[PDB]
Write a protein that binds this ligand. Sequence first.
Ligand SMILES: COc1cc2c(NC3CCN(C(C)C)CC3)nc(NCCN(C)C)nc2cc1OCCCN1Cc2ccccc2C1
Ligand SMILES: [Cl-]
Ligand code: NA
Ligand code: NA
Length: 196
Amino acid sequence: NIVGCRIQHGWKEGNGPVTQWKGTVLDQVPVNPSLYLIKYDGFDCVYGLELNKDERVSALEVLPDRVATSISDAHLADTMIGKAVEHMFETEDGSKDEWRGMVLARAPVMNTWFYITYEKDPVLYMYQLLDDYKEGDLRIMPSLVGKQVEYAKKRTGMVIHQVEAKPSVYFIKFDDDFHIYVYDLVKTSAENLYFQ
Ligand SMILES: COc1cc2c(NC3CCN(C(C)C)CC3)nc(NCCN(C)C)nc2cc1OCCCN1Cc2ccccc2C1
Ligand SMILES: [Cl-]
Ligand code: NA
Ligand code: NA
């Protein structure tokens, strides 16, 4: 399949202009093989697209350049998984800000990258956390998969993955959006989610 490949495609919403995108295919979701998780070059979120049916996608092409294959410190990486973190980053004005979040897993395909999410935006992100850590920007603090989900806004989706390191945490793909939403099912954020 196209997992592990780099791809490029056009994107058009409605009568808007076509924009061009390059990225890396990370995963073909077991519970919905039409759904691919993609990391676009320079964009930090993980996106899910049903490439075989999404008419917003045009001119889909496999790129001839290979994904970097190739971690510098697998043991350090291992220890980050499941940890609460404070993640500092540089802002438009040159000052730094920080978001607190949780390291979820090593990313597939892109070896040096990690899945992470944040209280301020609880969707799936990917960063090279060992690079950010070495530069002093990362402080480490001391089955439902395949089921349908709804919440009242009726927003509908599917549970696509369970986080091994924190089994009450799941990834959800909603039908109306291309982000991957992350929820800890014991928390308030998840209290309007119901499953079938
Ligand atoms: C924008 O957030 C981050 C950018 C990062 C980021 N940018 C770079 C921007 C400038 N460079 C140059 C080459 C042109 C290219 C890449 N580089 C890195 N780590 C490599 C550098 N290191 C090791 C010194 N890490 C980053 C971590 C970020 O945020 C973590 C918390 C989650 N965010 C999501 C978010 C969304 C909207 C508002 C705010 C946030 C906060
Ligand atoms: Cl930064
Ligand atoms: Na620094
Ligand atoms: Na959408």
